Write a protein that binds this ligand. Structure first.
Ligand SMILES: CCn1cnc2ccccc21
Lengths: 39, 156
């Protein structure tokens, strides 16, 4: 029996931590909603 | 139950203790999450019940109480923020420049940030605070790192 609990407002935060790269990938999406890499 | 707009944890008591299986967005009276978080089950909000209204396994999305309301899109140039809500931890904003998933049916923005599976459904936002998609359906690349699509639904 699933339930929800509020965790916060949805707002852009100034000076948030900035990280993560920006890869460009060839992918395929199957009928089950699963992504896979195409090589 | 609580109908206030915002980001919410999705919890279950079926496993050991109380476990966070994902996250969602309440906007305009509709609760939005990824299909793999709830599998389309009904949800509780205090003494109230939220019933599924629309869903699609291939998009990996589901809306409750009404149709999908989120229609903002990544502009393809700007940095965005993942409003990550990890299990047992406070909501935290993480800024990043999305990468791209290239598919036979078009290109999708993607965020290369790795959080626990229970963070699925966390919103990705633009500089106006609009939700441009949900985090948590993606792939594991060459160096073993996780990259999520920026998954967005269609507002009818
Ligand atoms: C490799 C699986 N994985 C890692 N981090 C995640 C976050 C959301 C959904 C799945 C995730």
């Amino acid at each position: 029996d699933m339930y929800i609990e509020r965790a916060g407002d949805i707002t852009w935060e100034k000076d948030a931590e900035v990280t993560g790269n920006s890869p460009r990938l060839d992918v395929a999406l199957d009928e089950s909603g699963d992504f896979s890499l195409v090589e | 139950g609580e109908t206030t707009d915002g980001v919410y944890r999705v919890m279950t008591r079926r496993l050991l203790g109380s476990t966070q299986v994902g996250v969602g967005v309440m906007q305009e009276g509709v609760f939005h999450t990824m299909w793999h978080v709830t599998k389309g089950a009904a949800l509780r909000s205090g003494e109230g019940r939220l019933d599924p209204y629309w869903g699609d396994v291939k998009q990996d999305l589901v809306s409750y109480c009404g149709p999908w309301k989120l229609d903002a899109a990544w502009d393809g140039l700007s940095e965005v923020q993942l409003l990550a809500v990890p299990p047992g931890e406070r909501a935290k904003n993480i800024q990043t420049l999305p990468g791209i998933f290239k598919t036979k049916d078009g290109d999708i923005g993607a965020v290369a940030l790795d959080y626990p599976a229970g963070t699925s459904g966390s919103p990705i936002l633009d500089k106006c605070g609009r939700v441009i998609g949900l985090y948590g359906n993606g792939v594991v690349i060459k160096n073993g790192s996780y990259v999520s699509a920026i998954t967005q639904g269609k507002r009818e």
